[PDB]
A paper describes a structure:
Recently, a shortened Dscam (sDscam) gene family with tandemly arrayed 5′ cassettes in Chelicerata species has been identified, which encodes ∼50–100 isoforms. Chelicerata sDscams could be classified into two subfamilies, sDscamα and sDscamβ, containing one and two variable Ig domains, respectively. Crystal structures and cell aggregation assays demonstrated that both α and β subfamilies of sDscam used Ig1 for the isoform-specific trans recognition in a hand-in-hand manner. Furthermore, the cis interactions were established by the three FNIII domains of sDscam, which assemble into a cross fold with a kink between FNIII2 and FNIII3.
To elucidate the molecular details of trans interactions of sDscam, we determined the crystal structures of Ig1 from Mesobuthus martensii sDscam isoforms α1, α7, and β6v2. We also determined the crystal structures of sDscam Ig1 from another chelicerate species Limulus polyphemus (isoforms α7 and β3v7) to provide insights into the conservation of sDscam trans recognition within Chelicerata. These crystal structures of Ig fragments were determined at 1.3–3.1 Å resolutions. The crystal structures of sDscam Ig1 from both M. martensii and L. polyphemus revealed a common assembly of antiparallel homodimer for both α and β subfamilies of sDscam. A previous study has demonstrated that Drosophila Dscam1 Ig7 use its ABED face to form a homophilic dimer through a charge complementary mechanism to ensure an antiparallel binding mode. Similarly, sDscam Ig1 also employs the ABED face to form an antiparallel homodimer. However, among the seven Ig1 structures reported here, the complementary electrostatic potential surface pattern (negative in one end, neutral in the middle, and positive in the other end) has been only observed in the three β isoforms, but not in any one of the four α isoforms. Electrostatic and shape complementarity had been observed in all Ig1 dimer interfaces.
Residue numbers in the entry:
A (entry chain A): -4 to 95
B (entry chain B): -2 to 95
The structure:
């Protein structure tokens, strides 16, 4: 029937604060509001995240999971999720710090 | 090897929850040996899934999803993370503006 077209709104996500070398960290990007369907994009410090042996992105219909194993200093930085549907887009950026 | 005790990555609920929002939180280890099992509690009692409350557990994380959150969903949610070597629990408060 009538299809509501609602701009998406990202649920704010943040990284843990005393993360030390070698640990695993996960964050989720998901809408709190918005019409289906959703697309997700992850950025790190100005470029799209590239999956690797220790970095993985797993995207579902209504959320996307960023996983980093064996964190090191190179994994520190600002990670952004860009969320879109057919009505609009939203973005959230979270800073990851990695300590010795 | 394979006997590293689990430790949950601290999780928290958003601070902007209004009635009707979808909310998701994940429980996952920052350390610990695979395989894991997960349990969710609400105010000390295991979560009962329903039409608008879903628990989806994967190999290395568990997802709590609440559609159309309301005042009745407010409470203290615990994730219990288990493996062969031990157990950890983390609890976070879900608050809803009304
Ligand atoms: Na956090
Ligand atoms: Na998280
Ligand atoms: Na992932
Ligand atoms: Na760094
Ligand atoms: Na940035
Ligand atoms: Na976009
Ligand atoms: Na109880
Ligand atoms: Na799910």
């Amino acid at each position: 029937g009538a299809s509501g077209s609602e701009i998406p709104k990202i649920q704010p996500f943040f990284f843990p604060k005393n993360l030390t070398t070698g640990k695993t960290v996960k964050v989720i990007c998901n809408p709190s509001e918005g019409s289906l369907p959703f697309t997700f994009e992850w950025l790190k410090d100005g470029t799209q995240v590239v999956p690797s042996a220790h970095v993985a992105v797993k995207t579902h219909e209504d959320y996307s999971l960023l996983n980093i194993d064996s964190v090191g200093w190179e994994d520190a930085g600002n990670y952004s999720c860009v969320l879109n549907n057919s009505a609009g887009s939203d973005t959230h950026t979270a800073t990851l710090s990695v300590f010795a």
